[PDB]
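Handout, section 4.2: multi-component inputs.
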Amino acid sequence: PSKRSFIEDLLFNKVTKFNGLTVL
Amino acid sequence: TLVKQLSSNFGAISSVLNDILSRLDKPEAEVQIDRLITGRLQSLQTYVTQ
Amino acid sequence: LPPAYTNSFTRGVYYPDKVFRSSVLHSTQDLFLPFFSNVTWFHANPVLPFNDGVYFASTEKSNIIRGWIFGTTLDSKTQSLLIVNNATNVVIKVCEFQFYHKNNKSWMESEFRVYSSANNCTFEYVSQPFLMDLEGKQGNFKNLREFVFKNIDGYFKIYSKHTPINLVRDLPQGFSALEPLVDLPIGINITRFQTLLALSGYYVGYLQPRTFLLKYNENGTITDAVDCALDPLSETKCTLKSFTVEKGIYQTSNFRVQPTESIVRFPNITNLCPFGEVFNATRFASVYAWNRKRISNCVADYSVLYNSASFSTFKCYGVSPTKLNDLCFTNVYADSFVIRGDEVRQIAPGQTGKIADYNYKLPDDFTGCVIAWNSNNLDSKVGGNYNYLYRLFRKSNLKPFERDISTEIYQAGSTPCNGVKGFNCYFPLQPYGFQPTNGVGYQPYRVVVLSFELLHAPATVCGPKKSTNLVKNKCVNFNFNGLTGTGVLTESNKKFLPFQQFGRDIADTTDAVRDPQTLEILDITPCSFGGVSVITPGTNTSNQVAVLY
Amino acid sequence: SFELLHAPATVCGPKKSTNLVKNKCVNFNFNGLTGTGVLTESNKKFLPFQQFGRDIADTTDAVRDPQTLEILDITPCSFGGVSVITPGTNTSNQVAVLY
Ligand SMILES: CC(=O)N[C@@H]1[C@@H](O)[C@H](O)[C@@H](CO)O[C@H]1O
Ligand SMILES: CC(=O)N[C@@H]1[C@@H](O)[C@H](O)[C@@H](CO)O[C@H]1O
Ligand SMILES: CC(=O)N[C@@H]1[C@@H](O)[C@H](O)[C@@H](CO)O[C@H]1O
Ligand SMILES: CC(=O)N[C@@H]1[C@@H](O)[C@H](O)[C@@H](CO)O[C@H]1O
Ligand SMILES: CC(=O)N[C@@H]1[C@@H](O)[C@H](O)[C@@H](CO)O[C@H]1O
Ligand SMILES: CC(=O)N[C@@H]1[C@@H](O)[C@H](O)[C@@H](CO)O[C@H]1O
Ligand SMILES: CC(=O)N[C@@H]1[C@@H](O)[C@H](O)[C@@H](CO)O[C@H]1O
Ligand SMILES: CC(=O)N[C@@H]1[C@@H](O)[C@H](O)[C@@H](CO)O[C@H]1O
Ligand SMILES: CC(=O)N[C@@H]1[C@@H](O)[C@H](O)[C@@H](CO)O[C@H]1O
Ligand SMILES: CC(=O)N[C@@H]1[C@@H](O)[C@H](O)[C@@H](CO)O[C@H]1O
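Output:
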């Protein structure tokens, strides 16, 4: 229960402390 | 880049606001602080534009 | 007479200036009565405090409210402001009155029927009455007179409105802005407030620094307002410059955590700086061959030098004369020498002249201080001439902190040979213009130059500042040997090398600091700041909102 | 020590006043308030204490005259812009001008 098919998993695996800066 | 610019020291005696304020009196610090404000504002505007 | 409590709801708004504005929404910061402040009702002569300003309202007539007193503890030692409402006019006087608040006899004389004053002559103002009545019960029943009393800077301002209201033993609903009634440029100190009943009740509230959004109509009058500090919804209305907000989520503010307390840490240095050895040396070197002394591992009291008699000048560069006492330094040098006295300006970090160029030069940045004092005595002895002055270096602009005492020949270009005349031999000048106890430039101004290294290195010189303990695991305002900031101090569990004093991250900002007394390593984590947004269904649906941090 | 406020002047220099012109672009000075524009009857209901008015941009819109206490609107003089219409110099040297 996190899948994301086999090909999708490959895609996610391959691609890869602040002063006023945030991330939403 | 945006973060690194904070240490640039844009013509001021120090890149650290606290070091300016802890050393100089009001009428002197304001000048040094304004130099950093201009530089940091310009750096931030550059970031946003990009 | 007894108190009671209520709520202002909308009351206390007034025109902040003298500018006509119509069909606009204007945001202004001034002293206002918070929309829903707790207003104290009093039965109808108690003396209340006066803060930034006072809101006053009552439905009683002028035969009950005869005026007001504003000032400090009332006596002949201080001026008070007396505002009295008469049948036909208003009389306002400022003076060192002990009393002067009677003019109405009944039974109470213990603190009245006395007229002791000084040289009044201060804003003895007379005009039209502040309290106007209505045609009995042909009005709205009990006219509510609203007043705002401000004391800001050279002014005592009064705003008011009569606006008759429906009968109620409370503050009425609806919006009404007060207009300026009078503006008296009185230099008076007001800390207390008292009404004049000469004995039903009145309301008193207090103004606070607030930003209001004022809605003006086509006729230039204020018809509504929003208090920016009331709630997240009002904040949203104000940031959007609108009295109506559409369904959605808005970014209105920025969350902050305050440290509430500070931490100060220094090494246990019990030694004192050898300043006596420098300023009271009694033996000062010539500028030709100045004496360079170093100070370390001691406490530096600079106040004792700055805040001290017998100095002629004390000029600091890169640091304030009143702040250096709270700073840590490394390797402080004290250059001790004597000059002619008209050369004081020639030893500045950026000036030129025979001293700056040949005898003693400073860096262009030079963080430090140049201190000098008369000391005409002892040095400028009659018949005494002891101040070598370096004039000839062949080159110029010697070097910052370089001492050249080579005494070579200044070949004038006349010939590449040795000799005296036409060779300008002997680099220093022996004609010392001492002019014993006479003229100008007669060798006043013994000079001590304090050069400081404002480095990341362990402090060697600290000021007379007392340390505190550590708090840890809390947002605090810290100072470690001059290293200041705000954040949470925690055990770092980092393997610092034996010589390292602090650490930095990839951004090259302070990540951790070594404590100067325990030598433990603490991480510095910034306190939460996040941001604040407000979730609303829209003001045409409900006034309920949710807030996201 | 001077207070350079928008409030009614309490201290004035030894400067002589002139009459009003109205309905013309003029260079005006009202108690130190200066600018260039056309002064006209505002027909605005100023409150008894107001000295001048401003617009949404928070710029001077109208001024009260210190002697007559009448309210005058201040309308910026025309500035527009000027462009030149040409068929090309390889055709003719006649042009039209648009203001
Ligand atoms: C502005 C304000 O603080 N109002 C509160 C009110 O909400 C509360 O109900 C009452 C005590 O019951 O105390 C007042 O001070
Ligand atoms: C009815 C009334 O109070 N008249 C007052 C008088 O009491 C006061 O002494 C005097 C001071 O100038 O001013 C009058 O207007
Ligand atoms: C008690 C009292 O007010 N004494 C006043 C004093 O305040 C004032 O400063 C001085 C003239 O300068 O004349 C005295 O009579
Ligand atoms: C009773 C009292 O607080 N008096 C102070 C006065 O000492 C101070 O000098 C002045 C400000 O200049 O403010 C007044 O409120
Ligand atoms: C926005 C507004 O309230 N306009 C009214 C106007 O309709 C009325 O005619 C006039 C008095 O004649 O007073 C103005 O304040
Ligand atoms: C560091 C030092 O001792 N400075 C002395 C000062 O203590 C003394 O009070 C003063 C008298 O004029 O002369 C200074 O040189
Ligand atoms: C290494 C170190 O500084 N140890 C300090 C000591 O110098 C100081 O005297 C004492 C309190 O009196 O507290 C110790 O932690
Ligand atoms: C769904 C809804 O309530 N819409 C109202 C509309 O009925 C009202 O006439 C208008 C103001 O004139 O404001 C809108 O928000
Ligand atoms: C209210 C006002 O200022 N009226 C002025 C008057 O002061 C002046 O003396 C006169 C010319 O002499 O012109 C009037 O309009
Ligand atoms: C339509 C027309 O007149 N075109 C002319 C061309 O004949 C001339 O040779 C050239 C300059 O060499 O300039 C062009 O504008």
